[PDB]
Ligand binder design. Structure first.
Ligand code: CL
Ligand code: CL
Ligand code: K
Ligand code: MG
Ligand code: MG
Ligand code: MG
Ligand code: MG
Ligand code: MG
Ligand code: MG
Ligand code: MG
Ligand code: MG
Ligand code: MG
Ligand code: MG
Ligand code: MG
Ligand code: MG
Ligand code: MG
Ligand code: MG
Ligand code: MG
Ligand code: MG
Ligand code: MG
Ligand code: MG
Ligand code: MG
Ligand code: MG
Ligand code: MG
Ligand code: MG
Ligand code: MG
Ligand code: MG
Ligand code: NA
Ligand code: NA
Ligand code: NA
Ligand code: NA
Ligand code: NA
Ligand code: NA
Ligand code: NA
Ligand code: NA
Ligand code: NA
Ligand code: NA
Ligand code: NA
Ligand code: NA
Ligand code: NA
Ligand code: NA
Ligand code: NA
Ligand code: NA
Lengths: 53, 337, 132
RNA sequence: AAUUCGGCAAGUUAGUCCCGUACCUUCGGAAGAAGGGAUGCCUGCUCCGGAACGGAGCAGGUCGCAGUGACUCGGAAGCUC
RNA sequence: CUUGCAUGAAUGGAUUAACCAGAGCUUCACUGUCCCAACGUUGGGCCCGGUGAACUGUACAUUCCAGUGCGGAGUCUGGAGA
RNA sequence: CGACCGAGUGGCUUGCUACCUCGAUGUCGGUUCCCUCCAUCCUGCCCGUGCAGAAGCGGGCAAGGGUGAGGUUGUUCGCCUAUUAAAGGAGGUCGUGAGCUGGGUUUAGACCGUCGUGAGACAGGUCGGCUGCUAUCUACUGGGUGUGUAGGUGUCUGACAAGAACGACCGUAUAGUACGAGAGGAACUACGGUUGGUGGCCACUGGUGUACCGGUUGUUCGAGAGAGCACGUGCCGGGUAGCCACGCCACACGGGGUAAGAGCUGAACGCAUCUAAGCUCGAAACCCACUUGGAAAAGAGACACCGCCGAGGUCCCGCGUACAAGACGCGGUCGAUAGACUCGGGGUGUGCGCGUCGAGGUAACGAGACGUUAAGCCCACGAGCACUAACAGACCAA
């Protein structure tokens, strides 16, 4: 799998899957990504993000 | 009307005092079933990781599927059965009769013992067979020691000595079996006793935590509401009734917590191997790098990293053995993050 | 009951106000009791995903209000663990009103549902729009 | 708020400007009722005034999760005695 | 509503906007009050140098379980333990 | 189900008495924490039935475990709700204020009603109204120093001691079966899970993280750069290790003897008889099994080796798998024990400086944008590595 935020590979037997109100699904690799997203930030604007890179 | 409620903690693991021997001492042994053989081995706790396994359980609605399981890594290098001690049956229980040693000793066994320079492996052996003839022979146990030198992550070079019982076929046959293991040089490995997929009883001296209070030590409540702001936050209500006019030992009080001996039952052995497949990126925290004879135990194990842990075939297994579980993945991800 | 096939950290208590995910007419529901549960001294009784709870209607149509009915928990904010280690959590806390035979009282469910709820209440799940 | 005799203790709200504001009432009040929006920096400017290192606004640009960014700084509504 | 054990008109009756660190109740908001506790910060606590009190004291005193006795005993009696 | 009448046991209520204390044994209710009783609410095993089944009703053995959350009320009591296997009762100075709380009773202030000429009263109501002490002894929980057993090292034994280390529920197959007109509707057994309790652990999720890195407000160091203060982080954002629970792992079966009970053989009493002798079974209860402690068990223990002029030990030195003092464990050049350095593995989120752009502005000036730059800064972890420090050396001892 791959983090729907940063883009790195999610180590198996790890991570969280947030389910949105509409039923959408977002797999996160770490708390850091979860928290940045909660601030309204977008992975493409953060330089450390694989997505951005 | 004061609701009923179970007492705080168990009265079965006391007195809660510091352990005398850091090296655990099993007080029970398996039953004499199959063929003769040593009933235990030892190693040093390294750390934890996780693995992916195929569901072995034939009764599970998920059998055959992937499943993530936590694993404690333990280095299990070969040990050495340096002697054969025999016990005799007397009206006052069992008593050590005689021992049978060797000549081949480890280079650093002298850091703990006063190594034998003059011995008689025959007279002793004779005495044992004479007693066996008399039908007074109790049981047979080997004196075993570890080789800390093999494990770099461990500072100590001074070996850990322990007495492990030998059980099996007939007394005569296992008496001979023992003598052989010893004479060689006593060298043996985890393979010789355990197979991946069996259940074992792991014993060890827990992580010491010095003096602790009742809340932590016994699991009693903290003062609630208004009571928590008066001058007492973590102290129990009373030490007992008016009569009996004495403090009963059953009431939860402060003291030494941890660094006790515990024997955790039915630990499943996931994999016995060698090399560095289970080692973690950046090294195990506070331990080091694993590369050699190891054992993967399911769940947790009593004690901190580096502590000596002992193995014994489960004396009261709840389930049947499902050998060699299919391991599809061993996490090597760094434990720092 | 039948095994859920996942571990649950109960995110709800007795007295909690949650969302009624259906078209029965009820909007907000209050937990009163949990079927089959019996805790310990001082412990506030707890409920979570896949549990069957007794509830009172806090908001909704005049007729549905104040009624004491049964329901099934479908979504919760506190994380749960799947057999593969992955954690799963929802946007809110929700339950669906149900009758004596565990059949949904309403005609339609509002929002997603946990796949685990199907293993227990098939007739509720067999009305789901989204099963995550 | 499930705690407790009781929300005790702690917390919440907060400066300023615009919008907007119920019952009742001795017409004074109720009232900051309630509820909603705005708020920084940089650039060039308009208005009041003699002028301020006084005040009120406009236009464009622009950064942060957050612009009374710390500090300072009300929690609100109802019934009865 | 009211038959008031035993209300009532300046021993004042009824009533009331505004005001209140006054008594009781309800809602929204908020939260470690609670479920159920955890980790951390600062000052003590503990060890060391120096300084250096007081409360209390018939005697004896390692106690426990029962009994007895002015009927609520570390001290009497029998045991147990030490 | 059970009147009348008759015989009792308990010491929870109430009443009686006035033995003990008035140079004081702190109140009610609650809370917390520990032990117990059985007259048993549930759970085990049984007997009868107006026992088809299923659901009951009544009775016996049985105190292992359990018996919970809430609304009014200070309440004890009790009424009420939804859950539950069930939501039993009672003793411990109506257990428990040198533990807590202080709502009630019962000080001094005030009001109402009734009574009184009045001060004032009330076994009427109501608002307000204080919780002292540095533990000598004894007791228990944990930690040491000595002596006895009479040189040392390592390994054990087990008299005794503690345990609930486990209790209970739901579901599936059995089975829509047995039973039954039908409605309805089981069990032995085997599996899966939940809950309460218990012990341990941190890979995973979560919390903390005044280590750390970043953003930003006010003020001082002239600006810039880089910094101090704003309670012991100014505030905001992220957060490693460790510690933790809200996270994760583990916690029998089976034997032996019995109770109630079901029976066998069997006599007194040719028959009958579960009993008088003898025997086969049979409880969550008893004993073992399992876990924990345990040579001071005064019958003060056993074995193997080393040593009695030398084995072993304390002190010293570098450190923690340990720790309030003490204790415990490890390494000491026959070395990787700690530090420096370099890697690796991690945390932040792109450094200063320069260059281009930049709304505008004559210009000066200019918030900010891109690049250089996964950059700069930082680490309680690992590896490599004798460069530095484990040096010199003292003492005890048959
Ligand atoms: Cl308390
Ligand atoms: Cl409930
Ligand atoms: K008195
Ligand atoms: Mg106080
Ligand atoms: Mg980690
Ligand atoms: Mg991670
Ligand atoms: Mg309570
Ligand atoms: Mg309440
Ligand atoms: Mg309460
Ligand atoms: Mg307050
Ligand atoms: Mg002008
Ligand atoms: Mg503020
Ligand atoms: Mg009133
Ligand atoms: Mg008049
Ligand atoms: Mg007293
Ligand atoms: Mg009885
Ligand atoms: Mg009992
Ligand atoms: Mg009392
Ligand atoms: Mg009591
Ligand atoms: Mg007391
Ligand atoms: Mg007091
Ligand atoms: Mg005191
Ligand atoms: Mg009072
Ligand atoms: Mg009051
Ligand atoms: Mg009062
Ligand atoms: Mg003597
Ligand atoms: Mg500061
Ligand atoms: Na105090
Ligand atoms: Na205090
Ligand atoms: Na007392
Ligand atoms: Na009158
Ligand atoms: Na005033
Ligand atoms: Na707090
Ligand atoms: Na009597
Ligand atoms: Na007196
Ligand atoms: Na009390
Ligand atoms: Na019982
Ligand atoms: Na009540
Ligand atoms: Na008393
Ligand atoms: Na009291
Ligand atoms: Na007091
Ligand atoms: Na039995
Ligand atoms: Na001895």
């Amino acid at each position: 799998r791959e983090c729907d935020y940063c883009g790195t590979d999610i180590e198996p037997g790890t991570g969280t899957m947030f389910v949105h109100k509409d039923g959408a699904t977002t797999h996160f690799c770490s708390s850091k990504c979860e928290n940045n997203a909660d601030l309204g930030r977008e992975a493409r604007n953060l330089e450390w993000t694989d997505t951005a890179r | 009307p004061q609701p009923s409620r179970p007492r705080k903690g168990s009265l079965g693991f006391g007195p809660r005092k510091r352990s005398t021997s850091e090296t655990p001492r099993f007080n029970s042994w398996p039953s004499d079933d199959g063929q003769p053989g040593v009933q235990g081995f030892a190693g040093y706790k390294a750390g934890m990781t996780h693995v992916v396994l195929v569901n072995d359980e034939p009764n599970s609605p998920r059998e055959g599927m992937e499943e993530t399981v936590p694993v404690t890594v333990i280095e299990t290098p070969p040990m050495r059965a340096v002697a054969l001690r025999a016990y005799e049956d007397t009206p006052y229980g069992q008593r050590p009769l005689t021992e049978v040693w060797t000549d081949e000793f480890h280079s650093e066994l002298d850091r703990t013992l006063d190594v034998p320079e003059d011995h008689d492996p025959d007279a002793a052996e004779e005495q044992i067979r004479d007693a066996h003839e008399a039908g007074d022979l109790g049981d047979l146990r080997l004196i075993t020691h570890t080789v800390p030198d093999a494990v770099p992550s461990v500072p100590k070079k001074k070996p850990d000595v322990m007495e492990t019982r030998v059980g099996g076929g007939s007394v005569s046959d296992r008496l001979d079996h023992a003598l052989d293991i010893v004479e060689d040089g006593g060298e043996h490995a985890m393979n010789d006793i355990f197979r991946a997929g069996e259940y074992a009883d792991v014993a060890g001296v827990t992580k010491g935590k010095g003096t602790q209070g009742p809340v932590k030590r016994w699991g009693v409540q903290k003062r609630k509401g208004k009571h928590a702001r008066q001058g007492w936050r973590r102290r129990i209500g009373n030490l007992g009734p008016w009569n009996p006019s004495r403090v009963r030992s059953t009431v939860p009080q402060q003291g030494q917590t941890g660094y006790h001996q515990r024997t955790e039952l039915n630990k499943r052995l996931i994999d016995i191997g060698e090399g560095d497949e289970p080692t973690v990126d950046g090294g195990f925290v506070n331990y080091g790098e694993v590369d050699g004879p190891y054992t993967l135990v399911k769940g947790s194990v009593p004690g901190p990293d580096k502590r000596l842990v002992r193995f014994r075939p489960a004396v009261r297994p709840n389930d049947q053995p499902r050998l060699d579980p299919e391991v599809r993945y061993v996490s090597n991800e760094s434990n720092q993050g | 009951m039948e095994a859920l096939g996942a571990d649950v950290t109960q995110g709800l208590e007795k007295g909690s106000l949650i969302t009624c995910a259906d078209n029965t007419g009820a909007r907000e529901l209050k937990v009163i009791s949990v079927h089959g549960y019996s805790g310990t001294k001082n412990r506030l009784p707890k409920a979570g995903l896949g549990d069957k709870i007794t509830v009172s209607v806090t908001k909704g149509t005049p007729e549905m209000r104040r009624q004491v009915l049964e329901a099934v928990v479908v979504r919760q904010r506190k994380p749960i663990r799947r057999p593969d280690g992955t954690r799963v959590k929802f946007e809110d806390n929700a339950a669906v009103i149900v009758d004596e035979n565990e059949d949904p009282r309403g005609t339609e469910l509002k929002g997603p549902i946990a796949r685990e709820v199907a293993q227990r209440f098939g007739s509720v799940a067999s009305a789901a729009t989204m099963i995550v």
